Design an enzyme around this catalytic site. Structure first.
Site, PDB file in Angstrom:
ATOM      1  N   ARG A   1       4.976  12.319 -14.092  1.00 62.35           N
ATOM      2  CA  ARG A   1       4.522  12.885 -15.228  1.00 62.35           C
ATOM      3  C   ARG A   1       4.156  14.476 -14.642  1.00 62.35           C
ATOM      4  O   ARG A   1       3.343  14.862 -13.674  1.00 62.35           O
ATOM      5  CB  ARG A   1       3.231  12.649 -15.985  1.00 62.35           C
ATOM      6  CG  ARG A   1       3.031  13.335 -17.299  1.00 62.35           C
ATOM      7  CD  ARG A   1       2.034  12.652 -18.153  1.00 62.35           C
ATOM      8  NE  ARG A   1       0.525  12.875 -17.804  1.00 62.35           N
ATOM      9  CZ  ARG A   1      -0.096  13.948 -18.385  1.00 62.35           C
ATOM     10  NH1 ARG A   1       0.677  14.855 -19.022  1.00 62.35           N
ATOM     11  NH2 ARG A   1      -1.218  14.346 -18.076  1.00 62.35           N
TER      12      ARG A   1
ATOM     13  N   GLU B   1      -5.424   2.967 -13.548  1.00 61.57           N
ATOM     14  CA  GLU B   1      -4.533   2.348 -14.315  1.00 61.57           C
ATOM     15  C   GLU B   1      -3.541   1.745 -13.458  1.00 61.57           C
ATOM     16  O   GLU B   1      -3.033   0.653 -13.794  1.00 61.57           O
ATOM     17  CB  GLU B   1      -3.839   3.424 -15.450  1.00 61.57           C
ATOM     18  CG  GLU B   1      -2.567   2.751 -16.058  1.00 61.57           C
ATOM     19  CD  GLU B   1      -2.193   3.524 -17.141  1.00 61.57           C
ATOM     20  OE1 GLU B   1      -0.835   3.388 -17.366  1.00 61.57           O
ATOM     21  OE2 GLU B   1      -2.819   4.565 -17.592  1.00 61.57           O
TER      22      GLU B   1
ATOM     23  N   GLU C   1      -4.731  12.369 -22.312  1.00 61.37           N
ATOM     24  CA  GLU C   1      -4.123  11.716 -23.722  1.00 61.37           C
ATOM     25  C   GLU C   1      -5.618  11.284 -24.335  1.00 61.37           C
ATOM     26  O   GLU C   1      -6.697  10.917 -23.842  1.00 61.37           O
ATOM     27  CB  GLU C   1      -3.436  10.667 -23.261  1.00 61.37           C
ATOM     28  CG  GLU C   1      -4.139   9.518 -22.316  1.00 61.37           C
ATOM     29  CD  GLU C   1      -3.212   8.237 -21.990  1.00 61.37           C
ATOM     30  OE1 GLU C   1      -2.038   8.253 -22.682  1.00 61.37           O
ATOM     31  OE2 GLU C   1      -3.710   7.441 -21.270  1.00 61.37           O
TER      32      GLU C   1
ATOM     33  N   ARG D   1      -2.285   6.477  -7.939  1.00 69.17           N
ATOM     34  CA  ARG D   1      -1.978   7.623  -8.656  1.00 69.17           C
ATOM     35  C   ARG D   1      -1.892   8.720  -7.336  1.00 69.17           C
ATOM     36  O   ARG D   1      -2.733   8.961  -6.949  1.00 69.17           O
ATOM     37  CB  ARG D   1      -2.613   8.094  -9.819  1.00 69.17           C
ATOM     38  CG  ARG D   1      -2.250   7.308 -11.007  1.00 69.17           C
ATOM     39  CD  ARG D   1      -0.956   7.114 -11.633  1.00 69.17           C
ATOM     40  NE  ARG D   1      -0.810   6.279 -12.784  1.00 69.17           N
ATOM     41  CZ  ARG D   1      -1.065   6.849 -14.053  1.00 69.17           C
ATOM     42  NH1 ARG D   1      -1.753   7.615 -14.062  1.00 69.17           N
ATOM     43  NH2 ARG D   1      -0.993   5.712 -14.887  1.00 69.17           N
TER      44      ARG D   1
END
Ligand SMILES: Nc1ncnc2c1ncn2[C@@H]1O[C@H](COP(=O)(O)OP(=O)(O)O)[C@@H](O)[C@H]1O
Ligand SMILES: NC(=[NH2+])NCCC[C@H](N)C(=O)O
Ligand SMILES: [Mg+2]
Length: 356
Positions: A279, A224, A313, A228
């Site tokens: 997160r 994304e 998610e 990350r």
């Protein structure tokens, strides 16, 4: 903006209006007033409003429904981004600016469930975007490979606890890929929200995962966000998980220039990841409180926490295991974000203990 795109935009806006089952921030905040003022604007790399909203128009079960095709988009389409950003992150005015990076005093963090009665595993991740490159929808195949090369070369210089190996997705058997996904290490393939944002072009070129031998430190490349950076392990020792992440990020930042904005902090592809991009989550079993996912979500939201399924998610809980994490990422420091998760989880455990 050419008429073909304007027609598609007009058609998209009507679909949002008429979709009454839609509850996304996009539907909430893209009023006709806002739409009319930005629908003709175009960024320096040619991104239009259509590039921003199409995922939300095609997936009406979206919670947010927009993405930034390039950095400039955040300002060009400011009248849409700003209110969504304010809503999602819990108050971020036009006059607010994200505070400077502050990891804080790690020694003030605590182990979350010493008896090991509730928490299965603890994970903290951040996202980073490389200076000089746009986000997924505007990248060429050549750029995905160039970034992959730059990042994998950099990571090869990690040492000690963080020493590891880079595995490109292109070289990965289906069996290995599936196992790493099932064990919560690797990102899934074929996300429909990302696909419709034109964020998976040329898949799997330039995509991969770096990890150390224990798989306590991992880096995702070109999912994304460009990077990350992930620290995770079984149990509840948030202090250790967080300390590993801080060490890794500080180390990588001295080697790779990342995009930072004076107002939004670190820039990411989705506006819910701006600012700290942090997160911090637990996989946690709360059998009494989680009898009803709705009551669980209501309690969580009181502590500014979000609830996700076991595989991330848009997934369901398996065996009553939920992913609970801080919702807010912009407008508070890294330390404050990890504290909001710690303090909230501690209160949720107290509630579970008193629940009938
Ligand atoms: N505390 C945790 N322990 C183990 N795995 C986790 C934890 N939190 C999230 N995950 C895993 O991380 C992966 C990514 O989930 P996702 O919801 O897309 O999060 P992210 O914000 O990192 O992209 C999924 O496999 C999910 O199961
Ligand atoms: N990874 C993320 N950016 N998740 C939040 C947004 C996901 C999806 N586009 C939605 O609107 O629900
Ligand atoms: Mg994800």
């Amino acid at each position: 903006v050419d008429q073909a795109t304007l027609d598609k935009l007009e058609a998209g806006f009507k679909k949002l209006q008429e979709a009454s089952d839609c509850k996304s921030l996009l539907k909430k905040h893209l009023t006709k007033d806002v739409f009319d003022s930005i629908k003709n604007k175009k960024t320096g790399m040619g991104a239009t409003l259509l590039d921003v909203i199409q995922s939300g128009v095609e997936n009406l079960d979206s919670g947010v429904g927009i993405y930034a095709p390039d950095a400039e988009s955040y300002r060009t389409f400011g009248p849409l981004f700003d209110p969504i950003i304010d809503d999602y992150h819990g108050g971020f005015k036009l006059t607010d600016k994200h505070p400077p990076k502050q990891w804080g005093d790690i020694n003030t963090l605590v182990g979350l469930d010493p008896a090991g009665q509730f928490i299965i595993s603890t994970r903290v991740r951040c996202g980073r975007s490389l200076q000089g490159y746009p986000f997924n929808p505007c990248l060429t195949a050549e750029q995905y490979k160039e970034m992959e090369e730059k990042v994998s070369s950099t990571l090869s210089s990690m040492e000690d606890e963080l020493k590891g190996t880079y595995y490109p997705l292109t070289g990965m058997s289906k069996a290995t890929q599936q196992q790493l996904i099932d064990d919560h290490f690797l990102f899934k393939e074929g996300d429909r929200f990302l696909q419709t944002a034109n964020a998976c072009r040329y898949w799997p070129t330039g995509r991969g995962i770096f990890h150390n031998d224990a798989k306590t430190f991992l880096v995702w490349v070109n999912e994304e966000d460009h990077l990350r950076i992930i620290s995770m392990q079984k149990g509840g020792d948030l202090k250790t998980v967080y300390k590993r992440l801080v060490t890794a990020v500080d180390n990588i930042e001295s080697k790779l220039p990342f995009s930072h904005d004076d107002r939004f902090g670190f820039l990411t592809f989705c506006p819910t990841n701006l600012g700290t991009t942090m997160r911090a989550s637990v996989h946690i079993q709360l059998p009494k409180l989680a009898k009803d996912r709705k009551v669980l979500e209501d309690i969580a939201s009181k502590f500014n926490l979000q609830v996700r399924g076991t595989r991330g998610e848009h997934t369901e809980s398996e065996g009553g295991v939920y992913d609970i994490s801080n919702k807010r990422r912009l407008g508070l420091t890294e330390y404050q974000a990890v504290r909001e998760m710690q303090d909230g989880i501690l209160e949720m455990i107290k509630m579970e203990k008193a629940a009938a």
